[PDB]
Design an enzyme around this catalytic site. Structure first.
Site, PDB file in Angstrom:
ATOM      1  N   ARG A 184       8.094  10.346   7.338  1.00 58.57           N
ATOM      2  CA  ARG A 184       8.970  10.183   8.498  1.00 58.57           C
ATOM      3  C   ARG A 184      10.443  10.372   8.142  1.00 58.57           C
ATOM      4  O   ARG A 184      11.230  10.925   8.914  1.00 58.57           O
ATOM      5  CB  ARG A 184       8.774   8.769   9.054  1.00 58.57           C
ATOM      6  CG  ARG A 184       9.565   8.460  10.331  1.00 58.57           C
ATOM      7  CD  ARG A 184       9.649   6.966  10.567  1.00 58.57           C
ATOM      8  NE  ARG A 184      10.267   6.271   9.437  1.00 58.57           N
ATOM      9  CZ  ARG A 184      10.037   4.997   9.132  1.00 58.57           C
ATOM     10  NH1 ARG A 184       9.224   4.269   9.885  1.00 58.57           N
ATOM     11  NH2 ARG A 184      10.621   4.449   8.075  1.00 58.57           N
ATOM     12  N   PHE A 225      -1.171  -9.900  11.219  1.00 60.73           N
ATOM     13  CA  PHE A 225      -0.156  -9.538  10.224  1.00 60.73           C
ATOM     14  C   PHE A 225      -0.480  -8.232   9.493  1.00 60.73           C
ATOM     15  O   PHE A 225       0.416  -7.409   9.241  1.00 60.73           O
ATOM     16  CB  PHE A 225       0.038 -10.678   9.215  1.00 60.73           C
ATOM     17  CG  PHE A 225       0.826 -10.277   7.987  1.00 60.73           C
ATOM     18  CD1 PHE A 225       2.211 -10.330   7.990  1.00 60.73           C
ATOM     19  CD2 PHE A 225       0.173  -9.871   6.825  1.00 60.73           C
ATOM     20  CE1 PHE A 225       2.938  -9.966   6.869  1.00 60.73           C
ATOM     21  CE2 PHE A 225       0.886  -9.488   5.690  1.00 60.73           C
ATOM     22  CZ  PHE A 225       2.285  -9.532   5.718  1.00 60.73           C
ATOM     23  N   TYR A 250       3.783   6.266  -7.886  1.00 60.06           N
ATOM     24  CA  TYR A 250       5.022   5.703  -7.365  1.00 60.06           C
ATOM     25  C   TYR A 250       4.754   4.785  -6.167  1.00 60.06           C
ATOM     26  O   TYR A 250       5.299   3.675  -6.079  1.00 60.06           O
ATOM     27  CB  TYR A 250       6.035   6.794  -6.988  1.00 60.06           C
ATOM     28  CG  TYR A 250       7.309   6.181  -6.463  1.00 60.06           C
ATOM     29  CD1 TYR A 250       8.231   5.606  -7.335  1.00 60.06           C
ATOM     30  CD2 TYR A 250       7.575   6.142  -5.098  1.00 60.06           C
ATOM     31  CE1 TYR A 250       9.388   5.005  -6.860  1.00 60.06           C
ATOM     32  CE2 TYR A 250       8.733   5.552  -4.614  1.00 60.06           C
ATOM     33  CZ  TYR A 250       9.634   4.992  -5.499  1.00 60.06           C
ATOM     34  OH  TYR A 250      10.776   4.397  -5.013  1.00 60.06           O
ATOM     35  N   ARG A 301      18.112  11.407  -1.893  1.00 63.79           N
ATOM     36  CA  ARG A 301      16.900  10.837  -2.483  1.00 63.79           C
ATOM     37  C   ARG A 301      15.710  11.735  -2.165  1.00 63.79           C
ATOM     38  O   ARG A 301      15.636  12.260  -1.057  1.00 63.79           O
ATOM     39  CB  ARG A 301      16.627   9.444  -1.911  1.00 63.79           C
ATOM     40  CG  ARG A 301      17.830   8.507  -1.915  1.00 63.79           C
ATOM     41  CD  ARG A 301      17.477   7.136  -1.347  1.00 63.79           C
ATOM     42  NE  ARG A 301      17.160   7.154   0.082  1.00 63.79           N
ATOM     43  CZ  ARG A 301      18.055   7.125   1.067  1.00 63.79           C
ATOM     44  NH1 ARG A 301      19.356   7.071   0.808  1.00 63.79           N
ATOM     45  NH2 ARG A 301      17.648   7.139   2.329  1.00 63.79           N
TER      46      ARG A 301
HETATM   47  C1  LIG Z   1      -1.164  -6.165   4.145  1.00 70.63           C
HETATM   48  C2  LIG Z   1      -1.511  -5.274   2.958  1.00 70.63           C
HETATM   49  C3  LIG Z   1      -2.776  -5.523   2.148  1.00 70.63           C
HETATM   50  C4  LIG Z   1      -0.659  -4.111   2.480  1.00 70.63           C
HETATM   51  C5  LIG Z   1       0.635  -3.751   3.163  1.00 70.63           C
HETATM   52  C6  LIG Z   1       1.647  -3.821   2.015  1.00 70.63           C
HETATM   53  C7  LIG Z   1       3.039  -3.566   2.568  1.00 70.63           C
HETATM   54  C8  LIG Z   1       3.638  -4.487   3.649  1.00 70.63           C
HETATM   55  C9  LIG Z   1       3.815  -2.437   1.912  1.00 70.63           C
HETATM   56  C10 LIG Z   1       5.243  -2.230   2.416  1.00 70.63           C
HETATM   57  C11 LIG Z   1       5.501  -0.733   2.395  1.00 70.63           C
HETATM   58  C12 LIG Z   1       6.814  -0.374   3.099  1.00 70.63           C
HETATM   59  C13 LIG Z   1       7.216   1.095   3.094  1.00 70.63           C
HETATM   60  C14 LIG Z   1       7.636  -1.410   3.874  1.00 70.63           C
HETATM   61  C15 LIG Z   1       8.908  -0.910   4.581  1.00 70.63           C
HETATM   62  S1  LIG Z   1       8.562  -0.542   6.344  1.00 70.63           S
HETATM   63  P1  LIG Z   1      10.257  -1.096   7.129  1.00 70.63           P
HETATM   64  O1  LIG Z   1      11.470  -0.478   6.528  1.00 70.63           O
HETATM   65  O2  LIG Z   1      10.197  -0.862   8.732  1.00 70.63           O
HETATM   66  O3  LIG Z   1      10.178  -2.688   6.878  1.00 70.63           O
HETATM   67  P2  LIG Z   1      11.451  -3.625   7.118  1.00 70.63           P
HETATM   68  O4  LIG Z   1      11.966  -3.516   8.506  1.00 70.63           O
HETATM   69  O5  LIG Z   1      12.567  -3.194   6.032  1.00 70.63           O
HETATM   70  O6  LIG Z   1      10.988  -5.117   6.706  1.00 70.63           O
HETATM   71  C1  LIG Z   2       5.653  -7.831   4.389  1.00 67.85           C
HETATM   72  C2  LIG Z   2       6.053  -8.144   2.944  1.00 67.85           C
HETATM   73  C3  LIG Z   2       5.487  -9.396   2.282  1.00 67.85           C
HETATM   74  C4  LIG Z   2       6.996  -7.256   2.119  1.00 67.85           C
HETATM   75  C5  LIG Z   2       7.615  -6.011   2.764  1.00 67.85           C
HETATM   76  C6  LIG Z   2       7.639  -4.868   1.748  1.00 67.85           C
HETATM   77  C7  LIG Z   2       8.945  -4.673   0.970  1.00 67.85           C
HETATM   78  C8  LIG Z   2      10.284  -5.218   1.477  1.00 67.85           C
HETATM   79  C9  LIG Z   2       8.845  -3.879  -0.337  1.00 67.85           C
HETATM   80  C10 LIG Z   2      10.119  -3.623  -1.146  1.00 67.85           C
HETATM   81  C11 LIG Z   2      10.070  -2.202  -1.726  1.00 67.85           C
HETATM   82  C12 LIG Z   2       9.924  -1.164  -0.607  1.00 67.85           C
HETATM   83  C13 LIG Z   2       8.752  -0.182  -0.653  1.00 67.85           C
HETATM   84  C14 LIG Z   2      10.921  -1.112   0.558  1.00 67.85           C
HETATM   85  C15 LIG Z   2      10.648  -0.043   1.620  1.00 67.85           C
HETATM   86  S1  LIG Z   2      11.856  -0.157   2.991  1.00 67.85           S
HETATM   87  P1  LIG Z   2      12.947   1.228   2.516  1.00 67.85           P
HETATM   88  O1  LIG Z   2      13.556   1.904   3.686  1.00 67.85           O
HETATM   89  O2  LIG Z   2      14.086   0.563   1.588  1.00 67.85           O
HETATM   90  O3  LIG Z   2      12.079   2.234   1.570  1.00 67.85           O
HETATM   91  P2  LIG Z   2      12.547   2.822   0.131  1.00 67.85           P
HETATM   92  O4  LIG Z   2      12.498   1.609  -0.928  1.00 67.85           O
HETATM   93  O5  LIG Z   2      13.871   3.484   0.156  1.00 67.85           O
HETATM   94  O6  LIG Z   2      11.382   3.825  -0.367  1.00 67.85           O
HETATM   95 MG   LIG Z   3      12.493   5.154   4.200  1.00 73.59          MG
HETATM   96 MG   LIG Z   4      13.240   1.530  -3.070  1.00 75.22          MG
END
Ligand SMILES: CC(C)=CCC/C(C)=C/CC/C(C)=C/CSP(=O)(O)OP(=O)(O)O
Ligand SMILES: CC(C)=CCC/C(C)=C/CC/C(C)=C/CSP(=O)(O)OP(=O)(O)O
Ligand SMILES: [Mg+2]
Ligand SMILES: [Mg+2]
EC number: 2.5.1.21
Length: 334
Positions: free
Chosen positions: A183, A253, A136, A193
């Site tokens: 968290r 980044f 997942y 969820r």
């Molecule tokens: C650079 C690399 C190789 C891998 C990293 C891949 C990434 C960015 C995966 C995103 C995973 C999640 C959980 C982003 C939400 S944190 P958030 O909810 O604080 O983010 P938000 O404030 O919604 O943009």
């Molecule tokens: C930096 C970059 C290029 C992309 C950022 C990563 C993003 C926006 C991924 C979209 C899908 C996810 C894992 C959102 C997590 S924030 P959330 O609080 O919605 O987590 P949830 O989807 O509910 O598990």
């Molecule tokens: Mg969350």
């Molecule tokens: Mg989601």
């Protein structure tokens, strides 16, 4: 900047906050590519998360999402989520997507396609095993890491290895996603969820929701520490990944979010407050440290400091204590 691009950065700033700043600092063509990638993923996630959209209706949206990037008129006006604007104004985002170089479009579309398939697969099951947990997280976050890495390689600011080493890129995404899931236990439980893997939590309680009951706090914290220990196993790959980055803006980044996630896990470790809401992450300390930490030795020092904080707090009787010491000692010697 064009008006539509201006709008995209407005959306980025509104819907991120966590990534908005590091993205705007990216060099050359990486900046727009990553901004658009973020917004597209935000739109796809907003569909996935929306529990007012039935499974039957949601499945084709997730499968076909990647094709909507090429449908200049496509928008979605039925979402009741808080980021719905990215869906309602999707044509603005897809237009800027079609304005990117083909080599970026191909990566973004491919990841969107694969993510959609994976998100739909999980609409009819909870997460059972630790392998399922990894699967997942791969679909929702590891593929983001792989996508980002392929963008970095396609831009030629980084070597082909960054895009090619999908295991390390996947670990980067898994680490962030697992940290967030850990968290957000209570917020997720309150919103109906469930992301904690059943094969883990069911060794402690009969329902994941039972960790919110005060009588189960000791069991809850044991499970918390077990899951944190699992997440820590990604840190060796995070160090390997970060160590290969050549471009300063790309390094920053990638490094900043990983450090924030480490600080989060350190704050959550052995912490009863996880089960009562947001825990005091010393995030200020992490933000402050990262201002100066623009190279690998400085980032390593910070990682070790947080690992040391977890290490000296490991309770003797915690069932994962040996495992937690073992992974920390491995990280220290990477
Ligand atoms: C650079 C690399 C190789 C891998 C990293 C891949 C990434 C960015 C995966 C995103 C995973 C999640 C959980 C982003 C939400 S944190 P958030 O909810 O604080 O983010 P938000 O404030 O919604 O943009
Ligand atoms: C930096 C970059 C290029 C992309 C950022 C990563 C993003 C926006 C991924 C979209 C899908 C996810 C894992 C959102 C997590 S924030 P959330 O609080 O919605 O987590 P949830 O989807 O509910 O598990
Ligand atoms: Mg969350
Ligand atoms: Mg989601």
């Amino acid at each position: 900047l064009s008006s539509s691009l201006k709008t995209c950065y407005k959306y980025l700033n509104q819907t991120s906050r966590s990534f908005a700043a590091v993205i705007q600092a990216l060099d050359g063509e990486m900046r727009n590519a990553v901004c658009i990638f973020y917004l597209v993923l935000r739109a796809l996630d907003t569909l996935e998360d929306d529990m007012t959209i039935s499974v039957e209706k949601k499945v084709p949206l997730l499968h076909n999402f990647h094709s909507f990037l090429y449908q200049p008129d496509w928008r979605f006006m039925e979402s009741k989520e808080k980021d719905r604007q990215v869906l309602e104004d999707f044509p603005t985002i897809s237009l800027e997507f079609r304005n990117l170089a083909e080599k970026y479009q191909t990566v973004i579309a491919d990841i969107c396609r694969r993510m959609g398939i994976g998100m739909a697969e999980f609409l009819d099951k909870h997460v059972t095993s630790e392998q399922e947990w990894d699967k997942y997280c791969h679909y929702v976050a590891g593929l983001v890491g792989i996508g980002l890495s392929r963008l970095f390689s396609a831009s030629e600011f980084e070597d082909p290895l960054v895009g090619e080493d999908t295991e390390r890129a996947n670990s980067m995404g898994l680490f962030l996603q697992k940290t967030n899931i850990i968290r957000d236990y209570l917020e997720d439980q309150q919103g109906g969820r469930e992301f904690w893997p059943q094969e883990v939590w069911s060794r402690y309680v009969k329902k994941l929701g039972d960790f919110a009951k005060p009588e189960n706090i000791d069991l809850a914290v044991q499970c918390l520490n077990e899951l944190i220990t699992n997440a820590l196993h990604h840190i060796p790959d995070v160090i390997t990944y970060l160590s290969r980055l050549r471009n300063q803006s790309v390094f920053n980044f990638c490094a900043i979010p990983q450090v924030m996630a480490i600080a989060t896990l350190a704050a959550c470790y052995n912490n009863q407050q996880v089960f009562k809401g947001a825990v005091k992450i010393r995030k200020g300390q992490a933000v402050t440290l990262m201002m100066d930490a623009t190279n690998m030795p400085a980032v390593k020092a910070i990682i070790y400091q947080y690992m040391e904080e977890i290490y000296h707090r490991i309770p003797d009787s915690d069932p994962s204590s040996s495992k937690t010491r073992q992974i920390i000692s491995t990280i220290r010697t990477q």
